UniProtKB/Swiss-Prot annotation, chain A:
Protein name: Small ribosomal subunit protein uS3
Coverage span on the entire protein: 172 to 227 of 243
Crosslink (Glycyl lysine isopeptide (Lys-Gly) (interchain with G-Cter in ubiquitin)) position: 31, 43
Annotated localization: Cytoplasm; Nucleus; Nucleus, Nucleolus; Mitochondrion inner membrane
Cross-link (Glycyl lysine isopeptide (Lys-Gly) (interchain with G-Cter in SUMO2)): 43
Post-translational modification Phosphothreonine, affected residues: 49-50
PTM comment: Methylation by PRMT1 is required for import into the nucleolus and for ribosome assembly.
Region annotated Disordered, chain positions: 29-56
Annotated organism of origin: Oryctolagus cuniculus
Family as reported in the entry's similarity comment: Belongs to the universal ribosomal protein uS3 family.
UniProtKB/Swiss-Prot annotation, chain B:
Organism: Oryctolagus cuniculus (Rabbit)
Lineage: Eukaryota, Metazoa, Chordata, Craniata, Vertebrata
Domain of life of the source: Eukaryota
BP-aspect Gene Ontology terms: apoptotic process; gastrulation; rhythmic process
Topology in the lipid bilayer: Peripheral membrane protein
Record key words, sorted: Acetylation, Apoptosis, Biological rhythms, Cell cycle, Cell membrane, Cell projection, Cytoplasm, Developmental protein, Gastrulation, Growth regulation, Host-virus interaction, Membrane, Nucleus, Phosphoprotein, Repeat, Ribonucleoprotein, Ribosomal protein, Translation regulation, WD repeat
Residues bearing the modification Phosphothreonine: 5, 9, 95, 276
A single GO molecular function term of this UniProt record: translation regulator activity
Protein name per UniProt: Small ribosomal subunit protein RACK1
Amino acid sequence: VRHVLLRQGVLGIKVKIMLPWDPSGKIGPKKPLPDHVSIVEPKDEILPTTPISEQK
Amino acid sequence: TEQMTLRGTLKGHNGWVTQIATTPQFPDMILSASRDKTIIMWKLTRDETNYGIPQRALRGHSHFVSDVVISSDGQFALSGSWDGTLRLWDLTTGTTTRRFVGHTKDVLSVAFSSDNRQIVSGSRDKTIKLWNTLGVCKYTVQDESHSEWVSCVRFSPNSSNPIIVSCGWDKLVKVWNLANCKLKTNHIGHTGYLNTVTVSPDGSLCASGGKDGQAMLWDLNEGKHLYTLDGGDIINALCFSPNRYWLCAATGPSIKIWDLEGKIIVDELKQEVISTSSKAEPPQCTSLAWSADGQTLFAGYTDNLVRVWQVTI
C-alpha cells in the first residue's frame, strides 16, 4: 500500500500478488494449497502371468 | 471320517483379533493379539460351560498390534504393532524387556528363529530387518527387496541350510539365504497383493495366498511351482498342519481345509446363519492357529471373537 501525492490530494495504490507455489524453490512458497489433493499414477503391472519361479 | 466341530468361543477383546499363537511347551495357554492395542494371554480352562478366561493383558502399544509369536520355551513373546516398534515381553509378569526401535511405518509381521537367536520384521517401508536378540539392528534389506509393502516374513524350520521367505504387496514371493541375506530365487504369479506366507513343518513347501483367492504351493528345494488351489473368495491366513498333510485356509467368512493327497477340500467351517438384514452378512475371518496337539484349531475373527474347532472322529 503506497500513497502518491499529486497537484490535488493523495491517491492510494494497493497491489496484491499470488505466488505460484515453487516446490523446493524460493520464487513462491512450498507447502501447496490445502485443497490441492494430487494423485500419482504408476505402471509396469502386467496381466499376462504364468507361475514361473526364476532363480538367481 | 474326520470332521470339525465348534467346541467353544473365547471373549474378552474389543476390536478385531489379528493373530493367535500357541507354544508346544505349555498346552494350556494362548496368546491373542487384537486391534484394541492389547495382547491377551488366556487361562484355557478346558470346561464346556465356558472355554477360557483371559489370564493377563500385555498392555503398552500406541496402535494396532499386527503380529505376535511365542518363544520356544514359553517364557517370552515377541510382538509387532502399528507404531513401528517391536516388543519383547515376559509371559510371567508383563514388563516388556526390550523394544526394537527403528522403522518409519507400521510393522506388519514378526517371526522368531528356531533357537530364538535372530529376529526378522517386515514393515510398510519395503524393508526387511534382521535383529540381534538384544535390541539392535543386525542387517537391513534396503534394495533387491519388494517394491511395495512387505506383508509377511517367515523363517524356515530347517537345520539344513537356512531360508527366510517374504511375501509383499508387489505380488511376489521372494526367498533369501539367512546367512548371506541375498536372494535365492523369485516366484511370479498371484495376480493381486499377498496376505500371508507359511512353511510346512518338514520345511519343504511354501503355501502363499492373497487377494487373488488362490493358494499356491511352492517347493523350497526344487525351486519350482508345484500346484494351485482356488480358495474361492479371498485368503487372509494360511497355516499348515502339525501332524497331518492338510492346509487350513482362512477365507472371508469360512475356513477351507484341504487334504493335500488328491488335493481335495475336507470341510467348510461356516458359523451361524442368521438372516443379516442388509449388506455383508458375516463377520470375516482374520487369523487361525493349529494347536501343537494337532487336535484343535483356534480362529480369530473380525467381530472380537475367537472360536475353537476340534477334530472329531
